[model samples]
Target chain A: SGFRKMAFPSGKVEGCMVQVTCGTTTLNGLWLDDVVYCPRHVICTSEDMLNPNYEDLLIRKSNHNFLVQAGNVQLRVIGHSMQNCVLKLKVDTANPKTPKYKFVRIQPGQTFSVLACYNGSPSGVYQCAMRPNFTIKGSFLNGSCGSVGFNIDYDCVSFCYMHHMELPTGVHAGTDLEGNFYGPFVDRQTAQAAGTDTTITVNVLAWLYAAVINGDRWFLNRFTTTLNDFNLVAMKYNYEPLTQDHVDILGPLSAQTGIAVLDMCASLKELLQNGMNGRTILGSALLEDEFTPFDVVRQCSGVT
Target chain B: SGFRKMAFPSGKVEGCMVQVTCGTTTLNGLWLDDVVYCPRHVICTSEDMLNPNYEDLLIRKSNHNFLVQAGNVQLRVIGHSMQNCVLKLKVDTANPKTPKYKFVRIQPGQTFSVLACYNGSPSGVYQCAMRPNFTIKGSFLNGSCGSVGFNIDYDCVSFCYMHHMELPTGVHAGTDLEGNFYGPFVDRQTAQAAGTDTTITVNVLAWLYAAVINGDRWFLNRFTTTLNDFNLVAMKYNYEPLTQDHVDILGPLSAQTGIAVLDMCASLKELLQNGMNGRTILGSALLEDEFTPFDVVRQCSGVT
Candidate 1:
């Protein structure tokens, strides 16, 4: 009936792929038995199709991208790729009996937009993807035989990147406080094609790197990986991959951020003066726990 | 029943990793249980043991690589040793009374395929991993009383990478949009062993670099850490460790990004132009407070 938040059991930041969600269930990430579901408001999996992220239900699908705002909300499906298909904006295919989805026929060269997000479902997940031409009778998605064309795995950034706000700084961007940046980048394009994708990716890096310096590790790595993972898809049609050279405006955010933090963390001087760098020690704890870098970094400092 | 996005409380991006989905939870990096949490959906954390990231939590897993389109996600886990076991494609061990999972035995050398998508319990979360060995059932991931082998913690990112559709421009690439370039070795393959893993690490650098240039303090620092953190993982296996030379992708994205952004913020010219480079005083405000850097660049006399 409602959605829940899957977080660390305690003050935990690392653990096995365990599903702590108990009780009634139904959703996305896993597409089995002929029905599309939107379990998560945002997901990016199922390309190769052996979901190691979810429990029960082998080979999940709904490989399409997703988009949802955190506080308030906004949603839409666009045909950013060469393959144009029908966008089942919000379809609960799980219930075969009276299936529902808001359909949008995005033919070749088009951007079907249900611009108005589900305000009521601010903290909600909406299932959307490109399925074989499905019928849109009213607000319900209809098609028992409609095959899912390609996945629309949107880079649904639940956080708000206010449209009216600025890029590096500002109260809001071009839109509202509840919005996503890379949501559209999910469809995939070229290094040269994914315009803001590169820029935004860089901005995201700034924040993650900032977190690292201030004492956060998971955020740093998670986004760092996406920058790379998305590039594969970003350059899906390109002869080459999106590399550093592409960035011209602000220059290379990675190298700079990398060097700076390294200078901070790697400063044998700082480590030696203080154990575990204090707060960062806890942050770093989750990072190299089993590996015991905790001891190593400590030892390294002592050696220094 | 769907998912929601996690956003930062105010103008902050550091601290404990908790799941607080009050009337609505917020933050950009985390994925939880009760809810299809969007702490960081499109996430990918590191698996190395000696990380400078987070701490504890043995037996974690997700050996499988994670991919997110930048706009939404953060992922993390660990390679806490192991046991030759089957990484079930799906398993719900939380509730024994209703123990459910579709075990897809990933036999020694086997690939999977399921490109559909779920869209019922709208908001949701699943569990998966990149593990040692296994099999493949009719797409059912159930282990019953079987035990979870381990976790394959991907190097998750906790930064903010906006996914809008624009940014710094110039004439460089083949496309109409200005750009940078890099060759090789696409894919995240590390000199040590990890495949696409390495590639993802590099991308993280580029974005961080982009941030540094635009002028951000913290974010620049984070990715920089992961640059080093993930590198150690790359080297932990062998090859005496992945050095700066190993980051051949784009000439050490972190280092480059770190340096470039540093150069920008610490720009001799901007410093000469305004003098507010006052060792990070007012400029620091823009780097942190109300007035963001979104439009300043496009308007700054440095270019347009």
Candidate 2:
């Protein structure tokens, strides 16, 4: 086992905190020599004539950067034979720039540390690479002779925020109205788990009574299929429908009777905004649900 | 899609029956070919390879033959295109003089079948092969060329006859001087489920009880260590331990007073004769209840 360590200072405002560490314990004396830290993300290739290879270091949109605001974080490299290596840090963004590289030497059982703030570049994609330097004698092999890779992303939580807060109201009100009117219900554990300065958002929607008041026979025969069709379109793009359980909790409320149709329309509008075509919507709705009325709506909407 | 069906005859000497069917369905006029069946018992492989690649074939114990009483067992030729494929079946026993093979042409959208009687020879080893004759032009380009493999084994149920019978005495009684013993009880469903004509052996070894009576103290200490040692072994092998309910049933019996040690010992000897080891005997003792010293003697003596 080989270990590596790094520290990030507190009060860093633009990124999440992170740290690294390294260590090893074995009679064979496994050591991780050259270790790389990437301040910005970049891809690399291994060139061994007989076993050359290429791999995307970090997938774009799939990588995240965290700001370091506390003690150091540590990682260990295992089964490496070299005691010295080179670290290459690449920052990948729209503009091409030269990657950063660091040469490091590590001994068996030795500890290495790097301050996070001192190493990483600001507001960019980053990746790390480590190449072990090794030597061999006769038939026996000595030292490390391969490279390993790693990446880190840093972003401030403050960059994201919640903005929707209207709850359904009245006797036939949705779950939102009931909770809004009767509760300041604090989910203590969830709040504690979220920590201070973390804003939480909960969405409440009703659908049960909406189905009943809309008339199962009418809806199932006419609008139900259309609704189901629209829902299918939404699902094609990974959307979820309002659950019946939410509507059940709404109990009996006059205003909630037509809320189902209104909610479906709202959801349809959102899907369209996502670049989905009306034909695609109609096709998906027709294919997805069996509600005749809903299908008719989809048909009338020129979706199919 | 492809389909297959296999059947085992009733009232055969073996008296065991089994049927298997496999098939594929076409959708949207697309033929999804190259279907494969992986049964728990059967060895299947490609027919044209030299030295018969056993990569995925089932290994069999010497001395037993796999008897396919019904259905077409096709051994496919992998890598060859499916256009003009020919299915082949090979039956090889350790007896060189009796080696045999059957071949058949496989047409598109068609099925083939085979039937044969086999003996348990060179116990557990078997294989089959199949291949397509014609190569389709785009098949190789599209990376659609491949083979199917299967491994086979024989599952059996054993039987025995009871020449003498004795009923269990009540939970406890010092002795039964009178002939008023409990009536005989039979588990016909268990026997039926095991299959007809399943050969079973029964023994009434009375002397084994004496071994237990004298075997208690020494066996107890060794049994405890063995139980603990096996528990550690199970953990080393990544096995989950017995559940709380299981412990509830067995824990008390293992206690010094929860069950009579002599009876436990006698029961152990009986199980040991049936191929169970000392560890199994002690493990089971922890699960038994209502055993007494007298019962152990009577059981060992073939009285009940």
Candidate 3:
């Protein structure tokens, strides 16, 4: 009951074969509707660590041949051919009905995949369908035959493997390129309020949201990872993450000291060779002012 | 002791012995500490996988010479003089009252290394020695060897290595300079309560703290290793490393919005550059919002 319809032009209809594919790189393929006949996919994950017995994640489509790795929000799909017609794609439609063929070429027997989608929730189900294309379409045996002609229906979830330790925001974020949601970064306190495994899941997604979006700079990577590592350290000590709000309160250091330290690091690059001068300045900040290691922190404090 | 270091006060001390050194750069001569013997070397870690007994990780250092890789903590010391007479080094007259200098000037015939000292806790000990450079200082083989002849009794620790994943705070929190514990950053909770790791360690030892202290940029090395990468979509599926927090969250709408997006990114650099935008805003509600990620959680009416 995923769907039902007839081919065009009576017996000479092309592009009417089952089209199952995955990925975002292309378009051009048959599309959807309700009661999908596509085989169910597991969207494999950090599975087995816990025993939630959550059924939605374990099942997809109608059959059980499909499975994706857990934590994966985006996934790819491939379609089989019915007739020699081309494969295609369309979006935001309740049903494709008579979908367009703007995508590049793809044929059956040649299984292609739709890029993986990003699903940001802890878990949920989404809809999808298949279509036959071109001058002559083949018939779907139905019941459950994704290879031949079946519909697409998937249920995905991000779950806690062990709920072992709280997760870091570093793991939370996801951008649009994935199957769905942008893993939002909730405040750590909010995550704790939610409890256990989800705590990490929430923050992990959030970390991704702000940190990664900042770009491919090492500054971003190092800072966040370091943040997580510290959290890990706390956990290893059998403690809850106790530093979440540390940064929020680190009111900037004295302007004089902070600026002095920053200026030295900058000069290490532009003017001085070997940073000898920078080193000397720092040494004094060390021996005399008993200057602290506020340089890097203050520099990063401004942004991170 | 840059050595129970000494200058013979006369005569000779050629490159008379074998010196093998290890480091990131070549030097006039090897430098640095760890119950060191001679050549500059790396601090070995997690020597073996686990137990000839238990599996926890505390066992590696127990086995004398078979000691876990060369690099280790709480290092020891043994000085070998090439020639003789210039034996020397300073010490904490406390428990360091009686000691020896048998391993004087390692001859080509012998190879040795002092065991590493183990300051299990932290910031407990830090006192280095100076060099013995003069016109005619030689000899280190007579009786009580140390020139100012103080016995070398540091608990050196470094070895052939294996970079176990857990870098000790020894090398963990980036310090301004080495051999000291400024690893500040106590818990925001505890910090607010007790104030330490995040405090001195946190604030004082931040990546910017001691790490960038000497002004060497990459000085904050060896802490965080970059984690998972992703094709955003590849993750929508359920997974632990489940999703690679992809950031297509940055979805670009029509050129109208896309232009706005591009503008903001550029502005990230040009206009509100240097975080003027981020700063102005943070300072805004930072006063009133006192917001947490969860502060907005229930607010996010989504089923999520």
Candidate 4:
């Protein structure tokens, strides 16, 4: 129902043997309108081949064994070439259509590629949880399937995991889990007005943002596991990293002193140095680490 | 009884009339050994004059109308030259000798000059309370009566009110109400370990020290009445003021970040500026003002 047909391919001869083959298995080719059987593939004219939907269809054809439709989105599996594996997709909302992909049988070590009308729309994203020791991954328009393919034990794919969390003002800001924002703050009045939690969260994220955008993969390996995830994403995506000078303008001292709301780079730098060198930890209950200012900056800055 | 005598003056004839007179009252001479009845002062031989105890006795003779003893310390009232007024010395501890000056009459608008065997010893000081609109003042060795005289409506004097609280280490440190040491701290661990109160107190005192020692009295007049008190004392005593360079050495950021434990002057400076300019206040229940860092520095520093 999520698909619409182009003109019925002329001389379609019903449908050809699915033009795409998986190993030596002969199978039925699924098209937008209907499924049919034939001894050969339907021939494509310039019009048929040039159809805007053809690219999605091409991906569909190659991934016939694992292609599926869930509401308005289409999913295709790639990477695995060997034995069968099981994937479980759990939709957050209750929908009868959701059951269709709830338990899917596909080849192991595979990753998903999605095709949807609203490719990058936040509302169009969905997640799939697979087991054999579960993992969750999702994507919007573009999703990364690692070189080793998606590991059930190790990846969490989130269409919401932002690659460019920076603000339009070049201020570093982001949400770790989405919705709860941290940073780009100018002072305590505003930061605390947002919430006291932001006081600590901003500091944590600012440091982490700097680290992921500036530190090399090897350098941040010893830091928190979460930091390593960001580092890997940065390396894999080759994101435009923030310069140290860029971070210096982000007003780290704003939450502690109002005057620091401007030109606070040096203050923040000293805070980081003092935090790292001292024995007291700067932390809050909402955080994972009982980190000092140094821990946040040093680990994230990849200064080693 | 607190005094020791030199050898008897030759032909001393018991004791001589006190050479020094207060007002028109020809008061009896009180000495180390006796109260004398004579027409004039006994002649002074070099040995009699050079006697180590003579200078104190000299100060004693001139101030006879208002001189009294409290255990080991001697009290001499100065400045007052008009009609007699009352002074009450209340010993903090119960001593039998405490009642003697419980109601001694001295002139109005006067100050005290203390002569104790251990002049600056922490153990040898005492406080006195006066009335006709009560005021309190104490001294160990030196005390300042203001240009307007010790105003009953405005002044408090404590031998404990420090003029040079800077530590021997050249680090700024002082006690506000006695025994509670603040500042010259290197880090939060040590400052907090001393007392969490010290965290705020150190910041307050550090800024105040800088203010009183650096700010002119006029500049600090509009600040807290307490700060003005310190300024007045500084001017009256001509105490050696700490240089800006000296104050910068007193680490201000140590309590906030351990790394700031050293070389944190710039950090402290920024904090003061930010606090002064910002809306948020840095304060504690232990302090008077709901001060921001700037309030402490600006008000105390007399920087307007």
Strongest candidate by DockQ: 1
Instruction: Indicate which candidate wins on lDDT.
Output: 4
For model 2, how does the per-residue alpha-carbon lDDT over A190-279 read when each residue is reduced to its tens digit? 111111111000011122222333232122212232445655554554434433432343333324354444344344335334433222
- The Cα local distance difference test for each model comes to 0.21, 0.20, 0.19, 0.23
For residues B135-176, could you state the per-residue lDDT of candidate 1 as single tens digits? 111111111111111111112222211100111110000000
TM-score of 4: 0.16
TM-score of each: 0.21, 0.15, 0.17, 0.16
Order of the predicted models by TM-score, top scorer first? 1, 3, 4, 2
Pick by TM-score: 3 or 4, better one: 3
Chain A accuracy as TM-score for every candidate: 0.19, 0.20, 0.15, 0.21
Residue A247's C-alpha lDDT in candidate 1?
37
Query: Across residues A258-292, which tens digit of lDDT does each residue of candidate 3 receive?
Result: 32222222222231122122221211111111111
Comparison by TM-score, 2 against 4, better one? 4
| RMSD of model 3 against the true structure | 28.5
Model 3, B184: alpha-carbon shift in Å? 24
Off by over 4 Å in 1: A1-162, A167-171, A174-277, A281-304, B1-84, B87-210, B217-245, B252-304
TM-score of 2: 0.15
Q: For each of the candidates, give the backbone clash count.
A: 181, 101, 183, 12
Candidate 2 structure lDDT: 0.20
- For residues B1-304, what per-residue lDDT tens digits would candidate 4 score against the true structure? 0000001111111111122222332212212222211112122223442332423333444334433333234434333221111112122223221111111223211222111112111111111212112122222111111000111111122221111111222122212122122232221112221211212223333433333333211112222223233334334433222234333434443343232312233333333333322111111111111122332332222120
